[PDB]
Design a protein around this ligand. Structure first.
Ligand SMILES: CCCCCCCC/C=C\CCCCCCCC(=O)O[C@H](COC(=O)CCCCCCCCCCCCCCC)COP(=O)(O)OC[C@@H](O)CO
Ligand SMILES: CCCCCCCC/C=C\CCCCCCCC(=O)O[C@H](COC(=O)CCCCCCCCCCCCCCC)COP(=O)(O)OC[C@@H](O)CO
Ligand SMILES: CCCCCCCC/C=C\CCCCCCCC(=O)O[C@H](COC(=O)CCCCCCCCCCCCCCC)COP(=O)(O)OC[C@@H](O)CO
Ligand SMILES: CCCCCCCC(=O)OC[C@H](COP(=O)(O)O[C@@H]1[C@H](O)[C@H](O)[C@@H](OP(=O)(O)O)[C@H](OP(=O)(O)O)[C@H]1O)OC(=O)CCCCCCC
Ligand SMILES: CCCCCCCCCCCC(=O)OC[C@H](COP(=O)([O-])O)OC(=O)CCCCCCCCCCC
Ligand SMILES: CC(C)CCC[C@@H](C)[C@H]1CC[C@H]2[C@@H]3CC=C4C[C@@H](O)CC[C@]4(C)[C@H]3CC[C@]12C
Ligand SMILES: CCCCCCCCCCCCCCCC(=O)O
Ligand SMILES: CCCCCCCCCCCCCCCC(=O)O
Ligand SMILES: CCCCCCCCCCCCCCCC(=O)O
Ligand SMILES: CCCCCCCCCCCCCCCC(=O)O
Ligand SMILES: CCCCCCCCCC
Ligand SMILES: CCCCCC
Ligand SMILES: CCCCCC
Ligand SMILES: [Cl-]
Lengths: 33, 175, 193, 146, 77
């Protein structure tokens, strides 16, 4: 097996970035009076 | 016959050929047919479980105001069924699949649990904390008294009927 | 204007609940799955290890991954730092599941106080997750970890072994937990208005 | 080899779950029914103590918690918590730029305890929610993730 | 010893279990008679009076248990 972890790391970081993006959007909804 | 558990019905004698990587071999075969004795498990396991279920269902015939009494029935019958289940399973070969007696005990345990839940539902709708005093007249719809719970009246028919039909189908299936 | 305010409050609260559930799933996954660290091309032996569970190869040009380590057993864990990290991550799991339970309190209790309760609970869960993530590399000096990765690996030093998806997922969980806690605080205050 | 779960499902998992449910039944029993609720709680605790005996009958005396041990332990804590909940309820009933400050934007030091009379209302949904969440994490963990 | 068939001791234990079970049913019957049939308003006494049922049980349960003991011991000894 090709013992390299880039696509796995890439997709995990993509999912994490999506989650944090949605949560900062939640702050954008709140803090905007 | 040195058998305590079983009864030897008979024997069947035959012959055949068995294949192997080394070759074909003649095999003389006998088959002794055995039937387990049921009376011990009836007197020891099935009957006390049935009587415990009957005791659990007996709680429906008491007045709804006897909250500690009916709670004591429910939980102590649960404990008794637990003890009976553990004892019945202890004297049995340690098989990881469920046998017929396991299913019977499970259904009885569910029936006892359901009787306790039925009492809980009945007590949730009890209004007055005092039972009928005997002397005072109850005007059918202290001055006022709680009516007999229609949940109790329905359970008095439903629970024994359900247990009876379960017993009928169980014993018809396995016997 | 008030109805827009209330509808946005409701929608943002629902979204905060979904993201809380997502973070709880992340916490369970990172606690269970043993892919915090992984072998490399230059590693003496193959395999991987997480907080408590570790699998290592026999070393005969195959997998034959012998596996050992369960959190229920406090001895198979390679080092005390690993034990502390596993305990902290478990406590974070318990805290976040406790907030998901406290979602039930929304029926009766005032919305602000329950929002603050999950806010503090998620902040504490994030603090526990940070403590676990900081304490976990301390245990890389363990003789089993050294035997896997090599002699160069040590305290706070990856060496040949490389971090796999679970570690970065835990860091993402840390960030997510902090921001969810702040979101809960501001939501609880914005209900009061 | 893979073990079969039919006997364990029938014998200890389902009965332990049912005993936990019967412990929850105390929350719907009316307050001031002190003997009933106390008897229910303590006898459910006794029944869990009885049930926990058969958890390790098959196994050797290993010094780590198995999945069965964990399930039984958590159910025991659940019934213990129900009884302690009723005890607490009975005792307390018988007798700079973000928005404001670090006491009103956090710790609720404005009134808060006061509302203890509604502890049964909380426990009616809190206890089933906690047990259902525990079962979801418990069963998903031991079957799919690992 | 595990010897699965019915024995004298098994019969005695079953008999005693039946007696305690019957006593519990007797109380249940008394309770239903007082509280169930009430609001609608040795030779067995009338069912109406709960004290009559209790006195009948007081007389009869020891007598029936003694009869069971006599039959058991004479049949087995
Ligand atoms: C209080 C009033 C006084 C009551 C006094 C009675 C006291 C209690 C009864 C009996 C005690 C006698 C000792 C028990 C002895 C066991 C009974 C017995 O011997 O018959 C067995 C029948 O099994 C069987 O049909 C299995 C069935 C067992 C009986 C129970 C089935 C019906 C239960 C329905 C549920 C209703 C719920 C109520 C809801 C209202 C086998 O025999 P059989 O020759 O074939 O040999 C077969 C060979 O394998 C060795 O037995
Ligand atoms: C009420 C809860 C019912 C739970 C169902 C429990 C149950 O399935 O009991 C079965 C045996 O007893 C039975 O006849 C079940 C009788 C169900 C009667 C339901 C009335 C209540 C065992 O199932 P199994 O797969 O071993 O098949 C055996 C094979 O011989 C059936 O043809
Ligand atoms: C797989 C894991 C399974 C997860 C399952 C978790 C389930 C956990 C158990 C119960 C949740 C209970 C939620 C109940 C929410 C109901 C809240 C409600 O009734 O509406 C109002 C809005 O509240 C609010 O904005 C608070 C919003 C609460 C949001 C939480 C519920 C969302 C659950 C959506 C499920 C998504 C699943 C997706 C997973 C992939 C508040 O009322 P109210 O003004 O009258 O009071 C004011 C006071 O005077 C008296 O209460
Ligand atoms: C597991 C949870 C399940 C939840 C089940 C939920 C089932 C459920 O909701 O029950 C409601 C009802 C309550 O039963 P219940 O006997 O307690 O009825 C009340 C009781 O009689 C009170 O005494 C009455 O007041 P009072 O004495 O005169 O002062 C009151 O009338 P009122 O005050 O209005 O005048 C009555 O309402 O009974 C059914 O209809 C169910 C029949 C089917 C039962 C089927 C049983 C097998
Ligand atoms: C064997 C399983 C049986 C399950 C039967 C569940 C039936 C419960 C129906 C709830 C009825 C209801 O809403 O009224 C009770 C209280 C209302 O508050 P209160 O004024 O009556 O004190 O309502 C509440 O405040 C909380 C009610 C409970 C909601 C959670 C029920 C979860 C039950 C699942 C158990 C496994
Ligand atoms: C009370 C409510 C809100 C939270 C309950 C927390 C539950 C889900 C926690 C408490 C203890 C935890 C367990 C502790 C140890 C182990 C052993 C490990 O090898 C697999 C995970 C497993 C089996 C955990 C699964 C989740 C768990 C059961
Ligand atoms: C885990 C639950 C245990 C069993 C609890 C049973 C009690 C049920 C009480 C609620 C019955 C439904 C009430 C309907 C609303 C009403 O009209 O009062
Ligand atoms: C050691 C724990 C025993 C279990 C006790 C359960 C019931 C405790 C009730 C609350 C106790 C704390 C209240 C203190 C107030 C006071 O001074 O009386
Ligand atoms: C078990 C139930 C535990 C309930 C804990 C208290 C919940 C919050 C109580 C009210 C909060 C407040 O406004 O002061
Ligand atoms: C209703 C509240 C209780 C919630 C928990 C329900 C799950 C009880 C566990 C029953 C044992 C299930 C066994 C699953 C494994 C299997 O059968 O293969
Ligand atoms: C898809 C993997 C799910 C893992 C379990 C999630 C539990 C969420 C907390 C109840
Ligand atoms: C097995 C429980 C039956 C309940 C009928 C209402
Ligand atoms: C499962 C028990 C039901 C009781 C009658 C509502
Ligand atoms: Cl494990």
């Amino acid at each position: 097996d090709s013992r390299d972890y880039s696509t796995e790391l890439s997709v995990t970081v993509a999912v994490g970035a999506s989650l944090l993006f949605l949560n900062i959007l939640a702050f954008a909804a709140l803090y905007y009076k | 016959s040195r058998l305590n558990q079983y009864d030897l019905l008979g024997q069947t004698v035959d012959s055949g050929i068995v294949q192997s990587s080394t070759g074909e071999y003649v095999v003389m075969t006998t088959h002794f047919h055995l039937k387990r004795k049921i009376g011990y498990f009836v007197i020891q396991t099935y009957l006390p479980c049935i009587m415990t279920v009957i005791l659990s269902q007996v709680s429906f015939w008491l007045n709804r105001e006897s909250v500690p009494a009916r709670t004591v029935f429910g939980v102590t019958t649960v404990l008794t069924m637990t003890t009976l289940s553990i004892s019945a399973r202890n004297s049995l070969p340690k098989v990881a699949y469920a046998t017929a007696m396991d299913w019977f005990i499970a259904v009885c345990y569910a029936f006892v649990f359901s009787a306790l839940i039925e009492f809980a539902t009945v007590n949730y709708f009890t209004k007055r904390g005092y039972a009928w005093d005997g002397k005072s007249v109850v005007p059918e719809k202290k001055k006022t008294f709680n009516s007999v719970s229609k949940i109790d009246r329905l359970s008095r028919i439903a629970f024994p009927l359900l247990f009876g039909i379960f017993n009928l189908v169980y014993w018809a299936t396995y016997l | 204007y008030h109805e827009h305010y209330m509808r946005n409050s409701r929608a943002i609260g629902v979204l905060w609940a979904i993201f809380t559930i997502c973070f709880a799933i992340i916490n369970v996954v990172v606690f269970i799955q043993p892919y915090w660290v992984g072998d490399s091309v230059s590693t003496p032996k193959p395999g991987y290890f997480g907080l408590f569970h570790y699998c290592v190869g026999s070393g005969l040009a195959g997998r034959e991954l012998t596996c050992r380590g369960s959190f229920t057993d406090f001895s198979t864990i390679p080092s005390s730092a690993f034990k502390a990290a596993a305990f902290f991550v478990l406590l974070s799991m318990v805290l976040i599941l406790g907030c998901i339970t406290c979602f039930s309190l929304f029926f009766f209790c005032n919305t602000a106080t329950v929002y603050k309760i999950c806010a503090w609970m998620q902040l504490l869960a994030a603090l526990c997750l940070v403590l676990g993530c900081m304490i976990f590399p301390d245990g890389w000096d363990a003789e089993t970890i050294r035997d896997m990765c090599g002699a160069k690996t040590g305290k706070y030093s990856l060496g040949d072994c490389s971090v796999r998806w679970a570690y970065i997922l835990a860091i993402i969980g840390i960030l997510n937990a902090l921001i969810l806690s702040f979101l809960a605080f501001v939501l609880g205050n914005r209900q009061t208005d | 080899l893979s073990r079969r779960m039919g006997y364990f499902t029938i014998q200890t998992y389902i009965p332990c779950t049912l005993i936990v449910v019967l412990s929850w039944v105390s929350f719907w029993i009316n307050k001031d029914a002190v003997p009933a609720r106390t008897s229910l709680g303590i006898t459910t605790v006794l029944t869990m103590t009885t049930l926990s005996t058969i958890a390790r009958k098959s196994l050797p005396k290993v010094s780590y918690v198995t999945a069965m041990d964990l399930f039984v332990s958590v159910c025991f804590i659940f019934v213990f918590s129900a009884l302690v909940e009723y005890g607490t309820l009975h005792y307390f009933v018988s007798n700079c730029l973000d928005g404001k400050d670090c006491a009103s934007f956090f710790c609720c030091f404005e009134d808060c305890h006061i509302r203890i009379a509604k502890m049964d209302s909380y426990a009616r949904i809190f206890f089933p929610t906690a047990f259902c969440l525990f079962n979801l994490v418990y069963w998903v963990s031991y079957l799919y993730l690992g | 010893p595990k010897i699965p068939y019915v024995k004298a001791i098994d019969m005695y234990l079953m008999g005693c279990f039946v007696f305690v079970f019957l006593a519990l049913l007797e109380y249940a019957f008394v309770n239903y008679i007082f509280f169930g049939r009430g609001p609608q308003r040795i030779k067995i006494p009338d069912l109406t009076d709960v004290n009559a049922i209790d006195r009948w049980s007081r007389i009869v349960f020891p007598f029936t248990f003694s009869l069971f003991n006599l039959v058991y011991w004479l049949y087995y000894v």
